[PDB]
Amino acid sequence: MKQGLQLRLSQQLAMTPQLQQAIRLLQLSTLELQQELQQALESNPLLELPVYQGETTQTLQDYLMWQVELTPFTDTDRAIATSIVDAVDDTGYLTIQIEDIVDSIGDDEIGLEEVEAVLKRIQRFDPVGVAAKDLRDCLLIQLSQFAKETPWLEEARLIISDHLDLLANHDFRTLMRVTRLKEEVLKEAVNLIQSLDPRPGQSIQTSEPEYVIPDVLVRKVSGRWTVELNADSIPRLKINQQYAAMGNSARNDADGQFIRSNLQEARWLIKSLESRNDTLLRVSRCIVEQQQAFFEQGEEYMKPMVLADIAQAVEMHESTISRVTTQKYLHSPRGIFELKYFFSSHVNTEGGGEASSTAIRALVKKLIAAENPAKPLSDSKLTSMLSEQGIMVARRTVAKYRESLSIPPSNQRKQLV
Amino acid sequence: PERDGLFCARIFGPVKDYECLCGKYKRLKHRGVICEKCGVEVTQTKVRR
Amino acid sequence: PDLRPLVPLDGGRFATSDLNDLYRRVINRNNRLKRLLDLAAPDIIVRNE
Amino acid sequence: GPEEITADIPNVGEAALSKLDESGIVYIGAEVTGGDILVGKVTPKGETQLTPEEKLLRAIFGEKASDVKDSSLRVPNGVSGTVIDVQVFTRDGVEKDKRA
Amino acid sequence: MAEYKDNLLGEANSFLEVLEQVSHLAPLDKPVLIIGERGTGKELIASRLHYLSSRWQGPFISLNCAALNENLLDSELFGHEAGAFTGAQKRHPGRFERADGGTLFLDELATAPMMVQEKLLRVIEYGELERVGGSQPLQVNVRLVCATNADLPAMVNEGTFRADLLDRLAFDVVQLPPLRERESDIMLMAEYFAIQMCREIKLPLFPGFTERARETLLNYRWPGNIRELKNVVERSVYRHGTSDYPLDDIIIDPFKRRP
Amino acid sequence: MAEYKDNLLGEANSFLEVLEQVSHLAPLDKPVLIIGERGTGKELIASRLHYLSSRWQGPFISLNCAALNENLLDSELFGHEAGAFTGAQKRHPGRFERADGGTLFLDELATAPMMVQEKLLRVIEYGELERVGGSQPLQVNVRLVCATNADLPAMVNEGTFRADLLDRLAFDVVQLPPLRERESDIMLMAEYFAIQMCREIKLPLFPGFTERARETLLNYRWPGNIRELKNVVERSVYRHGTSDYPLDDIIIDPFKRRP
DNA sequence: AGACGGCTGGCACGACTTTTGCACTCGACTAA
DNA sequence: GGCTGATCGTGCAAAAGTCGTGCCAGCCGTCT
Ligand SMILES: Nc1ncnc2c1ncn2[C@@H]1O[C@H](COP(=O)(O)OP(=O)(O)O)[C@@H](O)[C@H]1O
Ligand SMILES: Nc1ncnc2c1ncn2[C@@H]1O[C@H](COP(=O)(O)OP(=O)(O)O)[C@@H](O)[C@H]1O
Ligand SMILES: [Mg+2]
Numbered sequence A: 001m002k003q004g005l006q007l008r009l010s011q012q013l014a015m016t017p018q019l020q021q022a023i024r025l026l027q028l029s030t031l032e033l034q035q036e037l038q039q040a041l042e043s044n045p046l047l048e049l050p051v052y053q054g055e056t057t058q059t060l061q062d063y064l065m066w067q068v069e070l071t072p073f074t075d076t077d078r079a080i081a082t083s084i085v086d087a088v089d090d091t092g093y094l095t096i097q098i099e100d101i102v103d104s105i106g107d108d109e110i111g112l113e114e115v116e117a118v119l120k121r122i123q124r125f126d127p128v129g130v131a132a133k134d135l136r137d138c139l140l141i142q143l144s145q146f147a148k149e150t151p152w153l154e155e156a157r158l159i160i161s162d163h164l165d166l167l168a169n170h171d172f173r174t175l176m177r178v179t180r181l182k183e184e185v186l187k188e189a190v191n192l193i194q195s196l197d198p199r200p201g202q203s204i205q206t207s208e209p210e211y212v213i214p215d216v217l218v219r220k221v222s223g224r225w226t227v228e229l230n231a232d233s234i235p236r237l238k239i240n241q242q243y244a245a246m247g248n249s250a251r252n253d254a255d256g257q258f259i260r261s262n263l264q265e266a267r268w269l270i271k272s273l274e275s276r277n278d279t280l281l282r283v284s285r286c287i288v289e290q291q292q293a294f295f296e297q298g299e300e301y302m303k304p305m306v307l308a309d310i311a312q313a314v315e316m317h318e319s320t321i322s323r324v325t326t327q328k329y330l331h332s333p334r335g336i337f338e339l340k341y342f343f344s345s346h347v348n349t350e351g352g353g354e355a356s357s358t359a360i361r362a363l364v365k366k367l368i369a370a371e372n373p374a375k376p377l378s379d380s381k382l383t384s385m386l387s388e389q390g391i392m393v394a395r396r397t398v399a400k401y402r403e404s405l406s407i408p409p410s411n412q413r414k415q416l417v
Numbered sequence B: 001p002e003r004d005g006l007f008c009a010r011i012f013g014p015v016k017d018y019e020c021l022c023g024k025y026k027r028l029k030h031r032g033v034i035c036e037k038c039g040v041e042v043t044q045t046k047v048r049r
Numbered sequence C: 001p002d003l004r005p006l007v008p009l010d011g012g013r014f015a016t017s018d019l020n021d022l023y024r025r026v027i028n029r030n031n032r033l034k035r036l037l038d039l040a041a042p043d044i045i046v047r048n049e
Numbered sequence D: 001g002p003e004e005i006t007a008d009i010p011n012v013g014e015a016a017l018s019k020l021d022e023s024g025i026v027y028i029g030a031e032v033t034g035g036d037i038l039v040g041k042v043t044p045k046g047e048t049q050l051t052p053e054e055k056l057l058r059a060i061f062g063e064k065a066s067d068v069k070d071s072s073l074r075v076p077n078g079v080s081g082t083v084i085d086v087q088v089f090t091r092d093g094v095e096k097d098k099r100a
Numbered sequence E, F: 001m002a003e004y005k006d007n008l009l010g011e012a013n014s015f016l017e018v019l020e021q022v023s024h025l026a027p028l029d030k031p032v033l034i035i036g037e038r039g040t041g042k043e044l045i046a047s048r049l050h051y052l053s054s055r056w057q058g059p060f061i062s063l064n065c066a067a068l069n070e071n072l073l074d075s076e077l078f079g080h081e082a083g084a085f086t087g088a089q090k091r092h093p094g095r096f097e098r099a100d101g102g103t104l105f106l107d108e109l110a111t112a113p114m115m116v117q118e119k120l121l122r123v124i125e126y127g128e129l130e131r132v133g134g135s136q137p138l139q140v141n142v143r144l145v146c147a148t149n150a151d152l153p154a155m156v157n158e159g160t161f162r163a164d165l166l167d168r169l170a171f172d173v174v175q176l177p178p179l180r181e182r183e184s185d186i187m188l189m190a191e192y193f194a195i196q197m198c199r200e201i202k203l204p205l206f207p208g209f210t211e212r213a214r215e216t217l218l219n220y221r222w223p224g225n226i227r228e229l230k231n232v233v234e235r236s237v238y239r240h241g242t243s244d245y246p247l248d249d250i251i252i253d254p255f256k257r258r259p
Numbered sequence G: 001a002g003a004c005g006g007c008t009g010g011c012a013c014g015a016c017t018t019t020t021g022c023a024c025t026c027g028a029c030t031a032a
Numbered sequence H: 001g002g003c004t005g006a007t008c009g010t011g012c013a014a015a016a017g018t019c020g021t022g023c024c025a026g027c028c029g030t031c032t
């Protein structure tokens, strides 16, 4: 023969189609895969205390109920108070409106005056501003709770009344122009207003751990990184040995055929599961080989990664890689992150560098965190930082990353030092 | 709560609050109505026992 | 379910024991048997379950 | 997310925070009564939508945004005494080590 | 790109003069030629120049001329797009494309096909070319480097090479001095060799040569410019196998048969 | 690092001393060249050297300059990436890439094309190269082994061989002892061949070789040093038929008629 | 007090990714 | 006919999406 690249000849079809079982195996379903396996095992018959928590935390709902019971109120007043307690947000605000509350009361005798009186009684509770549903209202109640001997009290009340917009935009100059307040003397009042404990009802909420079960665990102790999947999380199916030892002995053709079909289906399913597990392990090993460079380089200097780049590291099609990456999580000493989180776009950099979008965002966030509070860093100013990094980037598109990190506008982030 | 199992909704009664599983009809305004996407009586939690 | 609390030991796993493990075993056994009952199993097998 | 000890506990006075050091531990040799906080740890909270109320609060207060919950360590009630020493253990792969 | 050190053990007036000329040449992006003989530090000089230039940020890539297969030399040079051939499944990056913006260190300039020279002629001169299946050519820019150990003018007189190709190639060619022409201390050069060899053989310390050994080393044909010195030194070190006494007799010629 | 004596014989001659010297070279990973005519156990020597290092655990392979398809040989040296040529089903790993970290034997170096010579010299122990249709270069580790029955210095003087390749190779030269001159080891080799044949022929016992056969063997020039010796031993054993008495005849030329 | 200036923010075209919707005819015969 | 049963089966591709980066229109802070 010879070596060449002629482009006209006969050929055959591509990979044979209708591999539905393999397609499901390629996708990772985690507990959903476990549920499907349980359903199949239900279908396939040849496949196989004294200590109690006893905690009655009030959660401030019971505390509110006890306060209502301990407080003197009419039967209608008690019912209104209970209804108000029903519509309370976790942060401490009222979810429903006063008109909504009146409508839910559904009483002609019930009036807006009674609702206001109940709210004042509701305001007359610990913590102050209970179910205020308005930041100014809760702040006003909290300020009214304190004594008037404190300095900058009337000015703080006036600001909370109708000067909230300027503070929202941090419009100190506009606020000074409007309210005609003393310059730089209002900084103390602003700090005191910042010391108002927003969302006082948040203390009611108690922390609950988030049960996250990883799939792959990596140690890399003393180097020698070795990817190991969660053996406990690894599914395992058993063949019914008693059922296996009853197929040949069967004298009924129908029973024998059913046993053979069930055995074949179970064998195919077990083979598919083992192949999926092996493919996942190989993909994890390849990623860890890629992630080892990323882990050593750190989050700030994470290298860009491509789906095709990883598919090259393996022997399966990129479709299998994409399917396996779905619902994929792993554990590392640095932390636990999704497998798809590894991939990132490559940003052309000075000297031809390709910059990971995630790493670029992390570095930009670190730089923005280390910024002067009086003068927030500008997006155009971020071009200077990028040039200092020695790597080219898209400052115009960097605003997208900044918003992605939920970074407020630099002008909006401006505040008195 | 799971579906048609132990510690499940639509059986054994409502959940910690009068709120329904589908997230709709979550208020004391509803006293005995049952939601559509999830079948839940809007009642107190203590009836679960 | 209220009288048989989950009682999370580590928080990650509730491990309902001495109350639901028997329930779980009987439930899955009955589901398997009833599903198999519609498939005309051999008499020996179905009698075993 | 991870839980960090940064001594930035909301809804608490500075008087309680006086005895706590930068990372949130209490200075060695200090004395404590009742249920005072020892170490200030917080639990990250799942993010919410734009939430104009929360967005406004962050534009006003910020630096918390209800992102965390008070999970600090405090003395059991009816217990008083003083600290002899403290010990911190950090697994490898994490190198915060503010004052470790 | 401020400072870099690599080998450069040779310290001769001619060696220094070449280094100084390269230093001035290093800023220039115009293509140049390296000349010399076998084992004449050719690889080192090219690498030093490549790091030296402002393309220190850019990728310096070399290429052996005779290595290319005649079957797909055009794809090797320019490249191909996906589907251009039957086997074309992706836009294969070109060698110049890989070096686009960088430095191309052509190797064995003499040892190339005439068709190869013809193919590469206009692209270097025009600075623009296209791969197989390309819509429009790419006019990338990259400094060009090439070398050969033969007398290019002799080949041109023989017509062995395209006169125009070399003509639009020889902006300030660079030559090398022979080992016999190398007046640098051969003993000093071999000192680093002895140190590295003692390290490699895990020997305690270099036993050192003798005055007669030094005189004989001076009295050497040295057809191999550097490697032969390195190779003969390594052979003598391996044969000696003892730091108890300094080296006095050195085996060089492999043709001779021992007793 | 095991004994693995395997086919170790003929120590009466200075081949034993040659093996002793090669034992020192066994830990070495530098270039290796072997000298000797065909039929001199050169492959056996190379195998012993490769096995000698615990790097025998590494991939030890052999290759001879058999052209086959020149393009195919070029690809095998280079390594065909997937889709490089029309119809390429998948990436074909290179012959060099197959054995990294382990010894590689290069044979028929005399019978190597000059273009093939240049291709090999491209990575002249350079250690890094690029695959056929390879995007980025790869660097591997392997100790090459060289052997030929021809006078490389002569061909270099003749210009047939590549002088740069010769310099890049043959850090050590292993000259095969003349088995035609190794008369003392001839008797021991005959005994070993007889033992092997008795293992193979499975007859009652070896009658012997008398002395006429030994005298004829002494008269025989034995152009095939180690290969033809065993072949003639087998042929004579077969022709002898009955093993009642020691055989004195010698099966010299099978091409010549038996009678 | 109107204009520069950087922000902001959506809209656009390339450039990488991606999910799902896909099973012949066997080798048994099958004979009316 | 009427599909009818069955070795043996580790993509793929193709239209779809989705992002990268730039590119223009408005806006307020401001100082001339
Ligand atoms: N100044 C130097 N410092 C160190 N090594 C040198 C120097 N000059 C030459 N060499 C040696 O010369 C060798 C390179 O020779 P080179 O001309 O590249 O071979 P070829 O002629 O086959 O291209 C290197 O192995 C290097 O050790
Ligand atoms: N010292 C020895 N002991 C045993 N067998 C040997 C010895 N030397 C050579 N041989 C054998 O002689 C045979 C012929 O050698 P030869 O034809 O030179 O092999 P090659 O040509 O592949 O190098 C070899 O197969 C080898 O096994
Ligand atoms: Mg060289």
Ligand SMILES: [Mg+2]
Residues within 6 Å of the ligand: F041, F042, F043, F044
């Ligand atoms: Mg051999």
